[PDB]
Amino acid sequence: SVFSERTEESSAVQYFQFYGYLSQQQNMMQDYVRTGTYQRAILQNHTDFKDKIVLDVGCGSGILSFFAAQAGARKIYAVEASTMAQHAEVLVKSNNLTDRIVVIPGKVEEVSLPEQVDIIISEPMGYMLFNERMLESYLHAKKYLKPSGNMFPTIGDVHLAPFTDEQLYMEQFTKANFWYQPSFHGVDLSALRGAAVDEYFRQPVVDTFDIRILMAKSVKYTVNFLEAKEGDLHRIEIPFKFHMLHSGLVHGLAFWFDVAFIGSIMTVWLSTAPTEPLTHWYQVRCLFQSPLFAKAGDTLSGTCLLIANKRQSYDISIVAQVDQTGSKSSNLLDLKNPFFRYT
Amino acid sequence: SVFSERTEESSAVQYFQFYGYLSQQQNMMQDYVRTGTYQRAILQNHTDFKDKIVLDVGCGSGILSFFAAQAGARKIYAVEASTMAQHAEVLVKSNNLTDRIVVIPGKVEEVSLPEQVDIIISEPMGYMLFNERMLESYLHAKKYLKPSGNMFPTIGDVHLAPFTDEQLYMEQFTKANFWYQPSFHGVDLSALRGAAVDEYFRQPVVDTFDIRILMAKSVKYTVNFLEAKEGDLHRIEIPFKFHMLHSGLVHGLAFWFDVAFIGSIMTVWLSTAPTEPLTHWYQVRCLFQSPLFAKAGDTLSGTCLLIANKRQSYDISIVAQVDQTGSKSSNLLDLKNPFFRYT
Amino acid sequence: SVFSERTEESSAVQYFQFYGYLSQQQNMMQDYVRTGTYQRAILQNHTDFKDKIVLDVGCGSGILSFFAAQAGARKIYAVEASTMAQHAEVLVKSNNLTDRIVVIPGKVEEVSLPEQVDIIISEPMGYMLFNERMLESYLHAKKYLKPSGNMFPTIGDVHLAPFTDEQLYMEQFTKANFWYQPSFHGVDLSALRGAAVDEYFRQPVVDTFDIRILMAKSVKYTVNFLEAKEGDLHRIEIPFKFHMLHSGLVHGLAFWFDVAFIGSIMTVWLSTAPTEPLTHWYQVRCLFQSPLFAKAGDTLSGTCLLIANKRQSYDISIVAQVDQTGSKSSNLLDLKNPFFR
Amino acid sequence: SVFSERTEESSAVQYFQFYGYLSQQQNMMQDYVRTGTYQRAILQNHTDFKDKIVLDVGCGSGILSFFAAQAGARKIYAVEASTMAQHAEVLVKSNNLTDRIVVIPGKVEEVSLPEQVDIIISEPMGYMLFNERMLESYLHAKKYLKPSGNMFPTIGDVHLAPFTDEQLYMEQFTKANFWYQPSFHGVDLSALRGAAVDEYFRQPVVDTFDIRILMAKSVKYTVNFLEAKEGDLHRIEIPFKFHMLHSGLVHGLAFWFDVAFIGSIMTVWLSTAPTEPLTHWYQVRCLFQSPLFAKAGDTLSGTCLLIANKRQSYDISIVAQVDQTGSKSSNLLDLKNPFFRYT
Numbered sequence A, B, D: 001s002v003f004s005e006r007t008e009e010s011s012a013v014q015y016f017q018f019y020g021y022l023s024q025q026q027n028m029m030q031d032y033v034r035t036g037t038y039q040r041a042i043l044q045n046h047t048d049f050k051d052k053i054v055l056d057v058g059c060g061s062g063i064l065s066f067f068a069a070q071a072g073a074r075k076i077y078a079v080e081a082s083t084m085a086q087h088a089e090v091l092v093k094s095n096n097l098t099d100r101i102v103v104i105p106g107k108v109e110e111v112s113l114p115e116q117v118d119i120i121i122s123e124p125m126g127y128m129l130f131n132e133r134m135l136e137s138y139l140h141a142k143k144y145l146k147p148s149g150n151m152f153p154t155i156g157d158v159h160l161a162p163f164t165d166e167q168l169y170m171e172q173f174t175k176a177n178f179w180y181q182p183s184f185h186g187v188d189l190s191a192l193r194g195a196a197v198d199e200y201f202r203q204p205v206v207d208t209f210d211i212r213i214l215m216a217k218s219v220k221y222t223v224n225f226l227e228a229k230e231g232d233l234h235r236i237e238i239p240f241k242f243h244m245l246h247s248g249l250v251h252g253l254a255f256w257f258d259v260a261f262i263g264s265i266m267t268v269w270l271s272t273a274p275t276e277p278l279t280h281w282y283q284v285r286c287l288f289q290s291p292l293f294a295k296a297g298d299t300l301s302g303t304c305l306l307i308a309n310k311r312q313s314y315d316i317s318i319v320a321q322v323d324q325t326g327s328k329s330s331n332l333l334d335l336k337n338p339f340f341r342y343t
Numbered sequence C: 001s002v003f004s005e006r007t008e009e010s011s012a013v014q015y016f017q018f019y020g021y022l023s024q025q026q027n028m029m030q031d032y033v034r035t036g037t038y039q040r041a042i043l044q045n046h047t048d049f050k051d052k053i054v055l056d057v058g059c060g061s062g063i064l065s066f067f068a069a070q071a072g073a074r075k076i077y078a079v080e081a082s083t084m085a086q087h088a089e090v091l092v093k094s095n096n097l098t099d100r101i102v103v104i105p106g107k108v109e110e111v112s113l114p115e116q117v118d119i120i121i122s123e124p125m126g127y128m129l130f131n132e133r134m135l136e137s138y139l140h141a142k143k144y145l146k147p148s149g150n151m152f153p154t155i156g157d158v159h160l161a162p163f164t165d166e167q168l169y170m171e172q173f174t175k176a177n178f179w180y181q182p183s184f185h186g187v188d189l190s191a192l193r194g195a196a197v198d199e200y201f202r203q204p205v206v207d208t209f210d211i212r213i214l215m216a217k218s219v220k221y222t223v224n225f226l227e228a229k230e231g232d233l234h235r236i237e238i239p240f241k242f243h244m245l246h247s248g249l250v251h252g253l254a255f256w257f258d259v260a261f262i263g264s265i266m267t268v269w270l271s272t273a274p275t276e277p278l279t280h281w282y283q284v285r286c287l288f289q290s291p292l293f294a295k296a297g298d299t300l301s302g303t304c305l306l307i308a309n310k311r312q313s314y315d316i317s318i319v320a321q322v323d324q325t326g327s328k329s330s331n332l333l334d335l336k337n338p339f340f341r
């Protein structure tokens, strides 16, 4: 299967074991912004669902499928690969919807659907949108979508912006400098200080922040789920040219994302921006190894390259330079092992 | 391999990836009770090391091997399966001990050692002592131990005692009760409430507590690492009979452990008891889905059965009853997936 | 009789035996807010009583009739069905008011009065205003009221508002969870857990609380005693639409009531609101078996249906929903069996 | 029926409505002394139940029948008049004992049993033992008992003792004196003060107390349930002659009770005495209208006459005198309407 080919089995096992827990499903369900916005997007665009055939990619508890049912869908195929699939089946029965919702256990890349569908619904977004690589399953599912069929969400925007946060930056060295002591219980640890610094900076930082740390208007990279192919997500190149609104040291790039449900009646947005109420996605920050000084009016140019790996995540390569000075910075990050800083 | 035969590859990959991070080694190293007590046990029993051959099972950063070197060991074989092995080699060189500490990368079940050893050192204790199943590697390593050889630690004591803690119980039940809702966004979840209660209560609670919640003197189960065979740890049956010192609700059983380094000069104890300074092991509590009411003077009898599984952990079954009334409670816990309440 | 037809004898016996005790009359009389406010309402509107004919429905000790006498009433018919009537007569004589207060023993639905009256006075309010169904006797008594006659109290307002109180909810759930035990002295009780939850949550909680638990402005349901007919109280439908002021868990609805004495000189209010001094009515809360999550700005809509029963109380049906999400709750409560917290 | 003839319908309605509540059954069940002692009495006398035919009079939740089942009873007829009978039936089914326990809805005076029984079990005790008059149903049930059959409980002892409690005595007047004011909101209430006093003194006081208020060894009146006829409980004349252990003012009589289960293996006692842990029966105190002064060594003699009424309770007539002085006091109380004083 397309899934097995791009995924190490260990990662897959861990991944689907994770979503097999009712507590995790609960965690997602209790994100009111997320769940409420999905429900609103579906119900307020009822003409896109009334008497239509729906596919729910990775249904988990089945919540989105129930929303599709509330909107008057004729038939909903709810595909789920973790053991949660059996819990979803229990809920379909207890909610007396066996005639409209059909739970299909397995990976969307591997199962068979009896018919083509009018619309695909899913919640495949991870940290900085792409983590977990579930968007590829979402796009893969379009083999079951009728021509002129729709996708909910329809588009996803990843936003990047430079930030300044001296304390976050210094924190890394504060932690790494544990190893910079010549006699920890008689042992000289200093030779590993460099490796410890490297390790900490390889971790994207998951948490939220004050919008005032942002130093320029965000650059946006858009994925149109109606048009995109799975292969499009294997290598994501995000060029950027920031026009600095404030002077100071740029310690790295902040990441967040929006998705839009573009229905026949209206477009509904779900945003994880730092200007919006917090979600379980928080925001993500990737530090530069060396901060870059910029003046208001300077331009900070470069590239963020996301390379998919078989651990259902991305290797992140960020290169940035201040055009006016030529001062340059690079970093390589492992999105699979983020540092959850939020407290 | 003995290791591969008892371990799902997924679990192993995850497991050794975890210990490959310097931050984790740092976390363990910064547990001063742990590190200081190991150093004390080794240095105060220096005659057990001076001019001896040592095996360090799962050396991590290599700290224990350095303690063995400080104690005058002639040769130390430091076996480590994670990539941390590469970092240990760096420290051996930067500390000018290349003539004495020899890092051997690989599983202790799989590597080859040049000679038999006088003493095995290791830190194989997990939560509730047995978590991670690393004790089996430790015991397995005894194939390299001389007949008159020693083990550091030499023995392990698991302590269990009944506790009362209304707040914790209600804390978990509150979480479980999410699945009691008959109309979550219009969806009836209640059919899954039982499954949800089971899941949350399968989680051992890792944290510390006031000793006054304990309702009876602890029961002790001892493993002698010098005598035990790894096969002995596949099924661990711990019967208990508590003489209740206080009347009230028994919400579950609390667990901690001690290990002893029985050297020629002195015996040194490392304790994780709640009467002792806190360690990174904290303590572990297994909750009952329904508490058992007992009066002072009653006897609380039963069994704690640990069945090893392929995820490097144990399936825990606890059956307890108040003998005077026949009030019985049975419980299943998944030691691999605990709830870290300390945060 | 209208009373007997709507009342089981067991309930009636118990009810009037209850009010036959001097300790109970004492308990009510010592509610100073109540007694003082009634006295204030009557005396400050003395012109509505001066040389007037009065009917006191359910006079108990006779206190309100004495207030009517103080205000200058010419003659007061004080009707009382319990044995307390004999004690009231003792007080009428010991206070030398035999020429002005006339105790009529019996139920107001059954006795005969010599003449029509200018004004009816009564204290017929129970928990949630309607408990005990004495308002129906009060309204029934209007057959003795002259046209354009007055009633003290004149109107009653029932207030309802959503509240959050996790502690109360868990307090009740904890009690219910006794029946969750799989081995109580070796016996599995779990099969009855559902029935136990239903029973406990069927109990309205009588007590007071901090106003900060209230999550929206109260909704008001008004009964005009001058216009209402007793039949109006057999089935009381109270629709509601709350505009949520705070985000959180709605554990149920809180209930209280006000009554107003609309006299010629001034309008006097007697309130049991949690913003006001405590009375023996306290306040009443109806819990949901499962709380409803709401955000500030959401609307919580539904209906409270009160159906009178033959035990001189009400069967309560509460249906509520968060309009934005469709989260719905239905509950059935037995006002006859409240929990005094 | 015998029940209807001795009971006002209103009282019966209220009575069985009361026990129809799970909360009340629970209230009784949660009395650990009561329930635990019944269980102990039944299980420790297992030879009295093993392969026997049992009758449970007023089974309520059915708890005692399950205890009879634990003891090995062959068949248990569980009679219950309230709607609780249906809840008991649910538990019989859920505990897989339909082959051994037969729930019979209705009054034991009115239902038909197919067979004679070896032993009757019941918990028919009220305040002062006799309140609620359920002992008469218990004795009435012996028409179904084999000649060589047993009763559990086998005997009941009601204890009476003189007490001194100045504050309790004064309390009555403190409350009654509410009516002794000439202008309560302008009203002279004084004319009702006497009636208020009378009312308060007619109420037995239900609560507990310090045993030091007791001025003499209790007098005991024993009912042997194996020998007694229900008619014996219509008029209970309890003569007493107390040998005063302390000097002082006697304000009234305190009441409590014991029952004994006289089995083949052992006799088990259930006590509600103030020297024992508190039960849901508390204790009962009946005041004298006027206190009696007594010296240590004096004898306090008289009679407590309990006259059964149609409200499933008793009118209590107490006459007492100090023999040495001839000082006499009496009271008449209505046990149907006690004052619950406990705090």
Ligand SMILES: Nc1ncnc2c1ncn2[C@@H]1O[C@H](C[N+]2(CC[C@H](N)C(=O)O)CC2)[C@@H](O)[C@H]1O
Pocket: A003, A016, A019, A025, A028, A029, A057, A058, A059, A060, A061, A062, A063, A064, A079, A080, A081, A082, A084, A106, A107, A108, A109, A122, A123, A124, A134, A137
């Ligand atoms: N390839 C796949 N085939 C089938 N199911 C898949 C696949 N990849 C992930 N999933 C599942 O989708 C789920 C992703 N999610 C959504 C849960 C639910 N729709 C909600 O919105 O609450 C939890 C976030 C998660 O349960 C995964 O197990």
Ligand SMILES: Nc1ncnc2c1ncn2[C@@H]1O[C@H](C[N+]2(CC[C@H](N)C(=O)O)CC2)[C@@H](O)[C@H]1O
Pocket: B003, B016, B019, B028, B029, B057, B058, B059, B060, B061, B062, B063, B064, B079, B080, B081, B082, B084, B106, B107, B108, B109, B122, B123, B124, B134, B137
């Ligand atoms: N079968 C195995 N073969 C070789 N190494 C193994 C095996 N199982 C676990 N390990 C490793 O031991 C280590 C266990 N520990 C000890 C670290 C060090 N000794 C200290 O005290 O600081 C971190 C706690 C951990 O690094 C594991 O990777």
Ligand SMILES: Nc1ncnc2c1ncn2[C@@H]1O[C@H](C[N+]2(CC[C@H](N)C(=O)O)CC2)[C@@H](O)[C@H]1O
Pocket: C003, C016, C019, C020, C028, C029, C057, C058, C059, C060, C061, C062, C063, C064, C079, C080, C081, C082, C084, C106, C107, C108, C109, C122, C123, C124, C134, C137
């Ligand atoms: N249908 C009826 N006919 C005559 N009397 C009735 C009827 N229903 C209730 N009552 C009686 O009114 C009384 C109600 N109350 C009022 C006492 C007095 N007015 C005060 O405010 O202090 C005590 C509260 C109570 O004694 C009942 O017995």
Ligand SMILES: Nc1ncnc2c1ncn2[C@@H]1O[C@H](C[N+]2(CC[C@H](N)C(=O)O)CC2)[C@@H](O)[C@H]1O
Pocket: D003, D016, D019, D028, D029, D057, D058, D059, D060, D061, D062, D063, D064, D079, D080, D081, D082, D084, D106, D107, D108, D109, D122, D123, D124, D134, D137
């Ligand atoms: N004449 C009668 N026939 C049948 N049942 C009767 C009769 N009189 C009372 N009862 C019932 O006995 C019960 C008395 N009790 C016992 C409950 C249970 N056996 C226990 O020990 O927990 C609650 C205390 C109560 O439920 C009454 O409804």
